[PDB]
Amino acid sequence: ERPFSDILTSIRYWVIHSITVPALFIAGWLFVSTGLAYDVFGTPRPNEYFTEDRQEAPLITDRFNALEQVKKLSGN
Amino acid sequence: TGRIPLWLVGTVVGTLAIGLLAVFFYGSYVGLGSSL
Amino acid sequence: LVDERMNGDGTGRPFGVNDPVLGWVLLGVFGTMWAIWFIGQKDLGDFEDADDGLKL
Amino acid sequence: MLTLKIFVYTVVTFFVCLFIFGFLSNDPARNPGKN
Amino acid sequence: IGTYQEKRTWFDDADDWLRQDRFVFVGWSGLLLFPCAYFALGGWLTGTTFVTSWYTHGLATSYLEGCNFLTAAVSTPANSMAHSLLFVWGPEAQGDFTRWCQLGGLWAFVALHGAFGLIGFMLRQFEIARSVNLRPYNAIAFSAPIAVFVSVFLIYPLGQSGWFFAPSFGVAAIFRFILFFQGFHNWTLNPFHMMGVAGVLGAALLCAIHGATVENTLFEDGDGANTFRAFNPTQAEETYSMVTANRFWSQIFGVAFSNKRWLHFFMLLVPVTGLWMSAIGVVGLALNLRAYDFVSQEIRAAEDPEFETFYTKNILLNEGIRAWMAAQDQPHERLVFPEEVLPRGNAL
Amino acid sequence: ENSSLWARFCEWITSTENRLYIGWFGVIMIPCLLTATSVFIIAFIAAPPVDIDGIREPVSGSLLYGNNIITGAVIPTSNAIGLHFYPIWEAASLDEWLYNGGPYQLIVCHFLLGVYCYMGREWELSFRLGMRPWIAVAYSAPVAAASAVFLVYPIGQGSFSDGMPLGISGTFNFMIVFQAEHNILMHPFHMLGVAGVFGGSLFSAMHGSLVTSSLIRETTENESANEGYRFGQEEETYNIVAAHGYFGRLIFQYASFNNSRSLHFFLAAWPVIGIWFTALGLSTMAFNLNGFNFNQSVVDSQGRVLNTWADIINRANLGMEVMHERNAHNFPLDLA
Amino acid sequence: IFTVRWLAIHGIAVPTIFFLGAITAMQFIQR
Amino acid sequence: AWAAAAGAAGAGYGVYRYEAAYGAA
Amino acid sequence: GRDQETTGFAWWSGNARLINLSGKLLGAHVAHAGLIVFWAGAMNLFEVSHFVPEKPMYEQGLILLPHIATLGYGVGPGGEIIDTFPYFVSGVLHLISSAVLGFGGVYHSLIGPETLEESYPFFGYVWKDKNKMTNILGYHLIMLGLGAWLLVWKAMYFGGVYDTWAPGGGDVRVITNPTTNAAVIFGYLVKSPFGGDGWICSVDNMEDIIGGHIWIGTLEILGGIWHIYTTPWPWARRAFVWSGEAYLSYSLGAIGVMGFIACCMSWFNNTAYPSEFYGPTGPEASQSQAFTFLVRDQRLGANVASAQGPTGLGKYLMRSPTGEIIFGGETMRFWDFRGPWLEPLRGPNGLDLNKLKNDIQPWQERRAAEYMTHAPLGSLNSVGGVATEINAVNFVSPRSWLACSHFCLGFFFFIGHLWHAGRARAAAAGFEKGIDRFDEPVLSMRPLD
Numbered sequence A: 001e002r003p004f005s006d007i008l009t010s011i012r013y014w015v016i017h018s019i020t021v022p023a024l025f026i027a028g029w030l031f032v033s034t035g036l037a038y039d040v041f042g043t044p045r046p047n048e049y050f051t052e053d054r055q056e057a058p059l060i061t062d063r064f065n066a067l068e069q070v071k072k073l074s075g076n
Numbered sequence B: 001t002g003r004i005p006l007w008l009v010g011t012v013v014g015t016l017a018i019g020l021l022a023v024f025f026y027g028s029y030v031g032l033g034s035s036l
Numbered sequence C: 001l002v003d004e005r006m007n008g009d010g011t012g013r014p015f016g017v018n019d020p021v022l023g024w025v026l027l028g029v030f031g032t033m034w035a036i037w038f039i040g041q042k043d044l045g046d047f048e049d050a051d052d053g054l055k056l
Numbered sequence D: 001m002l003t004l005k006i007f008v009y010t011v012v013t014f015f016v017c018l019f020i021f022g023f024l025s026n027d028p029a030r031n032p033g034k035n
Numbered sequence E: 001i002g003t004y005q006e007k008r009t010w011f012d013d014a015d016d017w018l019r020q021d022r023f024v025f026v027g028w029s030g031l032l033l034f035p036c037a038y039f040a041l042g043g044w045l046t047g048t049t050f051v052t053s054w055y056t057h058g059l060a061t062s063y064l065e066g067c068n069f070l071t072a073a074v075s076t077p078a079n080s081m082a083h084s085l086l087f088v089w090g091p092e093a094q095g096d097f098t099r100w101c102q103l104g105g106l107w108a109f110v111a112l113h114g115a116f117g118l119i120g121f122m123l124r125q126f127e128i129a130r131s132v133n134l135r136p137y138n139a140i141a142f143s144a145p146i147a148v149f150v151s152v153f154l155i156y157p158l159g160q161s162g163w164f165f166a167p168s169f170g171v172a173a174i175f176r177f178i179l180f181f182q183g184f185h186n187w188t189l190n191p192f193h194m195m196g197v198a199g200v201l202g203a204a205l206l207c208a209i210h211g212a213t214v215e216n217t218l219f220e221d222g223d224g225a226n227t228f229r230a231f232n233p234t235q236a237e238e239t240y241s242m243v244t245a246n247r248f249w250s251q252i253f254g255v256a257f258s259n260k261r262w263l264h265f266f267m268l269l270v271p272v273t274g275l276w277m278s279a280i281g282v283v284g285l286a287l288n289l290r291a292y293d294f295v296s297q298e299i300r301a302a303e304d305p306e307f308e309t310f311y312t313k314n315i316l317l318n319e320g321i322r323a324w325m326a327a328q329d330q331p332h333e334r335l336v337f338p339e340e341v342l343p344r345g346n347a348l
Numbered sequence F: 001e002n003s004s005l006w007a008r009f010c011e012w013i014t015s016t017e018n019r020l021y022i023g024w025f026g027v028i029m030i031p032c033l034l035t036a037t038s039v040f041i042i043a044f045i046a047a048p049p050v051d052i053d054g055i056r057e058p059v060s061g062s063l064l065y066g067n068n069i070i071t072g073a074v075i076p077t078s079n080a081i082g083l084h085f086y087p088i089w090e091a092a093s094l095d096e097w098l099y100n101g102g103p104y105q106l107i108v109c110h111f112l113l114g115v116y117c118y119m120g121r122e123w124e125l126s127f128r129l130g131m132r133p134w135i136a137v138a139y140s141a142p143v144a145a146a147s148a149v150f151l152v153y154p155i156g157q158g159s160f161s162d163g164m165p166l167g168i169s170g171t172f173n174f175m176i177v178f179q180a181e182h183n184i185l186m187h188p189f190h191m192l193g194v195a196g197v198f199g200g201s202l203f204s205a206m207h208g209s210l211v212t213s214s215l216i217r218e219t220t221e222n223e224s225a226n227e228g229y230r231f232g233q234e235e236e237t238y239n240i241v242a243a244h245g246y247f248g249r250l251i252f253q254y255a256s257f258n259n260s261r262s263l264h265f266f267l268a269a270w271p272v273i274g275i276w277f278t279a280l281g282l283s284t285m286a287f288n289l290n291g292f293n294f295n296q297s298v299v300d301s302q303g304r305v306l307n308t309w310a311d312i313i314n315r316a317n318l319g320m321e322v323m324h325e326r327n328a329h330n331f332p333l334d335l336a
Numbered sequence G: 001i002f003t004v005r006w007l008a009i010h011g012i013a014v015p016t017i018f019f020l021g022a023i024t025a026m027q028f029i030q031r
Numbered sequence H: 001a002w003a004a005a006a007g008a009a010g011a012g013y014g015v016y017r018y019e020a021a022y023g024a025a
Numbered sequence I: 001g002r003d004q005e006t007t008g009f010a011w012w013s014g015n016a017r018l019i020n021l022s023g024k025l026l027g028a029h030v031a032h033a034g035l036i037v038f039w040a041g042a043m044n045l046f047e048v049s050h051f052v053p054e055k056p057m058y059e060q061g062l063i064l065l066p067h068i069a070t071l072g073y074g075v076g077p078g079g080e081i082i083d084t085f086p087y088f089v090s091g092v093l094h095l096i097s098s099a100v101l102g103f104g105g106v107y108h109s110l111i112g113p114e115t116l117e118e119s120y121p122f123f124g125y126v127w128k129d130k131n132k133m134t135n136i137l138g139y140h141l142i143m144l145g146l147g148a149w150l151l152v153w154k155a156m157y158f159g160g161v162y163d164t165w166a167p168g169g170g171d172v173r174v175i176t177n178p179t180t181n182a183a184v185i186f187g188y189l190v191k192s193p194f195g196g197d198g199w200i201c202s203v204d205n206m207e208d209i210i211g212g213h214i215w216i217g218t219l220e221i222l223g224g225i226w227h228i229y230t231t232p233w234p235w236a237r238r239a240f241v242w243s244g245e246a247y248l249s250y251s252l253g254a255i256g257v258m259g260f261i262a263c264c265m266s267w268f269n270n271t272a273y274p275s276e277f278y279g280p281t282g283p284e285a286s287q288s289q290a291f292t293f294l295v296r297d298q299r300l301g302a303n304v305a306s307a308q309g310p311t312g313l314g315k316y317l318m319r320s321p322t323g324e325i326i327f328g329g330e331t332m333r334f335w336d337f338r339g340p341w342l343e344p345l346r347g348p349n350g351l352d353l354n355k356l357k358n359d360i361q362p363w364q365e366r367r368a369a370e371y372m373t374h375a376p377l378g379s380l381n382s383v384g385g386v387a388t389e390i391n392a393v394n395f396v397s398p399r400s401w402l403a404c405s406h407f408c409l410g411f412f413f414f415i416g417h418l419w420h421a422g423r424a425r426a427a428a429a430g431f432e433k434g435i436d437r438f439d440e441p442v443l444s445m446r447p448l449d
């Protein structure tokens, strides 16, 4: 039953996947365009790479105290 | 089953797959990672 | 000068001949083996009529 | 050096004329498939 | 069951649902493969898209930063994390997800779930071959990609100073790890990579020849010019003349296969022997037991200032790779090279 | 008799009853690839050192001049010669030919003209044995890659000194210098070539193991399973349905090849097309097209350069190019 | 429909369209 | 023989001449 | 249309269905010839629209406009572009003619007869008819012959063509004296392809080019008349396969060499491919660098003759292996380069350093400095330096695109030769579908081969 070619040619597939598929594309568009992707993953925005303390690349350089150090490297 | 033709699905879905790929080459020359 | 060269490194000679014996090498060896092929052409088939090749 | 060049041109043109007149000596009929 | 007829426990009710002939086979291995392999692929596709490498490496590696498919990667942790497993509950990350990504812990997420994914995929093809009642040669061949993965991604950084010198999961990130091994390890010169090339590049030959020898010695089993139609996989006879194939290569190459079973095992043997040997060389490079130098040609080239080989040219090129990348390849060293101390040829 | 001298020679050249088939491509190939073989072995062992770079420093490549099998090579021709034709008879002495890289151009001219005719007689014996022809088309992919390294990349760069050295460590120098000047790793045709040899090694192990794991039980456990096949038997010694029906459950059912003839075409077409691209990728970089250059591509706000992994490849790239051919360059641009 | 074949495709296809919406918006982030 | 589209008329049998013993193609 | 089981060809080899369908095959070619003219119209107008006059023609990624510039339409002295409207007329006359070729190509593919053998006996052909095949071969040589006389008439009578070797700088020159000497014209053909010869890629002036097209024009008119009034001789019956796929494979091996020739033609030659329009060659940009730093350092007080390099050969001027005073450096390999900016400084005995210490002209150092920063190295994303170069400029030379595209096209059409010549020789022999399985010819051979 349903061998991958009566699904793609069925209209009930496209009365679902012309609504959920664009609303999921827009959900991915708004995850980044609302800046939330910069906050969840901690990637710096293009105005966040260099604070006034440092003008160089960060260096973690400390194992067990890295959690509060990367807060100081990022500038929070 | 057969309500829409499979070749018209594969044309249209293939077109905005080539169309989405052209956005990835458009965005490779402008904005982030454009070297300008 | 110091040594002896043939002096044909960038001269663009026809088939790279500069002694005329080299041209007779080209015509002698071609002519000897054209003649062996021509005399031996009686064993290759007489493809004399028009539809007489390997065709499709 | 010219003795070597004459010799190579006899040798190379011997084998090139074997190549050329070999395919002129009814190569397409040297098949096992009959028609 | 078991020809003594016990009563089924909840295992047998679980064993037959897992070993079900549905569309995608789960099996018992799928309790290990499908959660781990989905998170290696899911961790790689998330890290190349969103996760930075600005803190572990000082360089951007995500699509959101500006990288494309070639330059984006899931980059290794810093050399300050040593061999820390970087659990998100670990002493470095300590529960915070957005700093675990910044600390490069999402590298070890992909590397560990990818490693137990390869165990799950290799157990998958023991499990299917016991269902189908075949011989287990598909799994034994996959020991060699596991030999490559464990020796490069796991065994190599454990012998070095940290997970930093692991390969990052990217395209250009693999390429520097490749250029790291030339500049630092002289890894082309290592005879285990030489057996690794001859296995990999000799299996590509055997793939192309056996594919072309079969496809050009086929029996005329059909009428039309499509020769792919003249086959039914339930036929009892060979689809191509092995005898013609043998006589062809015995006159072209002088030596041909006469045994079809030895041929296909030789196609099995060459890429597996090639990768297991190259895995031993990366085990040797974990300890920096390099095949770097021929000492009899270094003593001669230092006592004779005109003795140049292509070997001594290669040693000079590795000095160029080492000094010109390590101010940026190894930022933990914090070495600054003034421009007059780096090696340099004439007018370049 | 009725047959001439030439006709009895044609029936011997095209004879399928020779042990090694000759054919009309073999009257070119055999005296070419015995010429290049004989002068390779003599120059790998006993050639005096060679001014490859044209700067009058000689480079040793011979076993008798302090080299081993790894570091020995037949050194490419001098840079002063370039693409000029330098046979033995255009030298004054034989030692001047040996000094200027003369043996390399004699090997490479006969080797390339011999592998073009090795490809020709793989066609020819297929036609004499009643076969389908295109094993020669499969062998055209290592022929094109051999043609790229020894002929086309010297033609594009303007000297046979930029051709690949005929040795193990000389090859490695050729690769390392290539990546500095052309960035071959970032070129998609080399990426496709790696996909052809990694795929071609995957598919050799994949097709090689499914056939081995589907062998019909013909022998006992005291004798190899390779004894169960007889050369010339007409039955088919493994189960293609069991092999297809195993790879079907391994990933997907319609992701397999139930057609063994369609399987072996894809088994031929994946390495051959991949090596066709990396032979052309090498030949497009011969004309200096080069690999992708993503250096200083990621830039943040205030116009400042964020490094990437491509910028680290560049640091490894420009370390090689400031050290390759270290005395040749009088001028800042390596345009040659 | 929540079967194994449904969970196989939508484990792959649902985040794929989510990231393709994300990557497409990254092509228009200027700086 | 039905004279296929590149010349070369088919030698008797049709496509996959083992359909009588195997039933498919 | 047509299907598989009525042909024996699948969808992926379905143009092989119309081998013996003469009318459908005609519409296949005329519609394809529409595409070549359509691309030549569309890519011409694309390059006219994107032409910027305050930039060189070779910097803008223009490969079709230098061909019309080499004919001398709309160019001035020194390669300056006067007007762009002659390049616009060439774009429209192809773009309009493509609809005419597109119409009859679509016509004979859909409405016109499938085989035009019984109704139109002049155009009908069977592939094994050796008279009709040479008859069509003779018709098209006269078209190629009269096409080769268009270049001669345009150079001798219709305004002239661009001569980059002209006295007073390169401009459009009517070629009043084309070289019809057979020892000169057929001397290129028997010349070696190597360094210092370059087979036919070293044709150094336009008088040999136009005089050579007189020869190729007459021989193709005469060779066309030869094949209309003759059939192939019995030795040619003995050597060839006389199928339609054989005639394709004959053309594929001929045209795959021509792709390799035009690969090395556009890379090395700067007469038929002028450097004002196509940019410097590989040899030209490397020789331009050594000339640029020779003039840079004479002005900074240095004897460039007596200047010894770090190897001891000579930093600026060294001696060629045949004894010519050439430029030093790694550009000793390109010493047999000739250029119209460089040849005014060159005497008999190589370069003349008396002429080169006193009589360097200011236009020569303008042009050679342009060629150094437009060397034909770039990247695939059109960056424009060595592989160790940052994203600053936007440049790949047209010579780098013309040679790289036409080596790849020349390589695949040699592969297409090996495909179709193997197949047509085997399909005419009967075993292109496979081994017969009843009389396998290996089974009738003596073992231990």
Ligand SMILES: CCCCCCCCCCCCCCCCCC(=O)OC[C@H](CO[C@@H]1O[C@H](CO[C@H]2O[C@H](CO)[C@H](O)[C@H](O)[C@H]2O)[C@H](O)[C@H](O)[C@H]1O)OC(=O)CCCCCCCCCCCCCCCCC
Binding pocket: C014, C015, C017, C023, C024, C026, C027, C028, C030, C031, C032, C034, C038, C041, C042, C045, C046, C047, D024, I235
């Ligand atoms: C610096 C210079 C460098 C050198 C020059 C380089 C450029 C050279 C290019 C020149 C052009 C070459 C083209 C040659 C085409 C050959 C094609 C061919 O296969 O040609 C095939 C045809 C076949 O012809 C036919 O061949 C037939 C064969 O018959 C035989 O068989 C028949 C049945 O088949 C009958 O039985 C018959 O009785 C029997 O004789 C018939 O005889 C016909 O009469 C006859 O017309 O040949 C012919 O037409 C004539 C062929 C052309 C003439 C060949 C001359 C070769 C050279 C001669 C000079 C040698 C000098 C020696 C010097 C010695 C001292 C050192």
Ligand code: CLA
Binding pocket: I001, I002, I003, I010, I011, I012, I013, I014, I015, I016, I017, I018, I021, I024, I025, I027, I028, I029, I031, I032, I098, I099, I100, I102, I103, I106, I109, I110
């Ligand atoms: C240059 C490319 C080219 C050309 C000219 C042709 C031409 C042809 N093919 Mg081939 N083909 C091609 C590429 C090409 N093909 C490729 C790439 C493939 C692989 C996918 C095939 C696979 C293929 C198969 C499998 C078959 C053909 C067949 C045919 C012929 C019949 C066409 C037909 O009935 O279509 C009818 C289709 C249509 C009418 C659809 C509309 C298409 C129209 C023509 C587009 C025109 C657009 C254009 C802008 C109009 C301009 C008009 C002008 C006034 C300006 C025809 C001569 C058939 C054959 O052999 O016949 C015996 C056949 O069976 N072709």
Ligand code: CLA
Binding pocket: I043, I046, I047, I050, I060, I061, I062, I063, I380, I381, I382, I398, I401, I402, I405
């Ligand atoms: C073969 C001749 C040829 C040559 C020498 C050039 C050369 C050039 N073109 Mg032109 N062009 C050509 C054909 C050619 N083009 C064709 C056929 C078209 C119609 C599509 C165009 C349309 C065109 C436009 C519209 C433009 C150019 C531009 C350019 C310039 C830069 C191109 C570039 O960046 O490529 C980048 C490199 C590539 C794209 C690599 C191509 C590799 C192909 C795709 C094969 C890949 C292999 C792949 C596996 C096979 C695919 C099939 C498989 C999936 C089944 C350069 C001068 C540009 C320019 O400068 O304008 C002023 C420009 O805007 N060209």
Ligand code: CLA
Binding pocket: I134, I137, I141, I189, I190, I219, I220, I222, I223, I224, I226, I227, I230, I231, I232, I233, I236
């Ligand atoms: C599109 C061009 C074209 C094509 C396809 C043909 C095709 C044919 N011609 Mg025609 N021909 C043409 C143009 C063409 N011709 C022109 C322009 C002329 C006038 C010059 C002639 C004059 C002509 C004559 C007089 C004859 C033919 C003949 C033939 C047939 C056999 C040719 C053969 O096997 O040569 C094989 C070629 C050789 C064996 C020569 C050896 C070639 C080697 C490589 C050395 C070449 C040296 C040469 C100087 C070139 C050096 C440069 C080179 C390396 C690039 C064939 C039907 C013959 C025939 O049957 O016609 C009735 C015949 O007798 N042709």
Ligand code: CLA
Binding pocket: I009, I011, I012, I013, I014, I015, I016, I017, I245, I248, I252, I408, I409, I412, I413, I414, I415, I416, I417, I419, I420, I423
């Ligand atoms: C002018 C040249 C020419 C002509 C007229 C033909 C004509 C034919 N060929 Mg041949 N062929 C050629 C060149 C040519 N070929 C070359 C150069 C190659 C080597 C690559 C081949 C390889 C070849 C094979 C392997 C086969 C044929 C077959 C055929 C027949 C049907 C083809 C068909 O329907 O295509 C259908 C078209 C397609 C399926 C699309 C293919 C598109 C590919 C992927 C390229 C895409 C274009 C891309 C931009 C190029 C990238 C490369 C670039 C970097 C240079 C027909 C007789 C077939 C046959 O029946 O044999 C008689 C067959 O099996 N040809």
Ligand SMILES: CC1=C(/C=C/C(C)=C/C=C/C(C)=C/C=C/C=C(C)/C=C/C=C(C)/C=C/C2=C(C)CCCC2(C)C)C(C)(C)CCC1
Binding pocket: I031, I032, I034, I035, I038, I045, I092, I095, I096, I098, I099, I101, I102, I103, I105, I106, I109
């Ligand atoms: C058969 C067939 C085919 C093919 C087809 C073809 C190939 C066709 C061609 C076609 C063509 C080839 C067409 C063309 C057309 C053209 C046109 C239609 C044009 C028009 C023009 C115009 C419109 C112009 C305009 C202008 C001017 C005048 C100037 C200004 C600018 C402009 C642009 C505006 C196919 C493959 C599909 C498939 C099968 C079938």
Ligand SMILES: CC1=C(/C=C/C(C)=C/C=C/C(C)=C/C=C/C=C(C)/C=C/C=C(C)/C=C/C2=C(C)CCCC2(C)C)C(C)(C)CCC1
Binding pocket: D019, D020, D021, D023, D024, I184, I185, I186, I188, I189, I200, I203, I208, I209, I210, I211, I212, I213, I215, I216, I239
């Ligand atoms: C325009 C011009 C010119 C001129 C040119 C000319 C005049 C040309 C001609 C040319 C020619 C005149 C060519 C020819 C060619 C030929 C060929 C290339 C041949 C081939 C052959 C073949 C192909 C064969 C094969 C075979 C054999 C081996 C034997 C027989 C059979 C067979 C087929 C198998 C010049 C440069 C001055 C200048 C520039 C421009």
Ligand SMILES: CC1=C(\C=C/C(C)=C/C=C/C(C)=C/C=C/C=C(C)/C=C/C=C(C)/C=C/C2=C(C)CCCC2(C)C)C(C)(C)CCC1
Binding pocket: B017, B018, B020, B021, E038, E039, E041, E042, E043, E044, E045, E046, E109, G011, G012, G015, G016, G019, G020
């Ligand atoms: C990580 C992580 C996580 C999360 C999440 C996940 C796991 C996700 C996944 C995700 C995913 C799983 C995603 C996917 C994606 C995909 C993509 C992104 C794709 C793309 C594609 C493309 C882009 C393509 C394109 C193309 C080509 C190339 C071919 C075909 C055609 C076209 C053109 C379309 C967890 C919680 C576990 C834990 C922590 C860590």
Ligand code: OEX
Binding pocket: F079, F157, F159, F161, F162, F177, F181, F324, F325, F328, F334, F335, F336, I330
């Ligand atoms: O030759 Mn072997 O590598 Ca083509 O860049 Mn310049 O030259 Mn040499 O240096 Mn870099």
Ligand SMILES: [Cl-]
Binding pocket: E313, F173, F177, F323, F324, F325, F326
């Ligand atoms: Cl070096």
Ligand SMILES: [Cl-]
Binding pocket: F328, F329, F330, F331, I328, I329, I330, I331
């Ligand atoms: Cl230099």
Ligand SMILES: [Fe+2]
Binding pocket: E210, E214, E264, F207, F211, F264
């Ligand atoms: Fe097989």
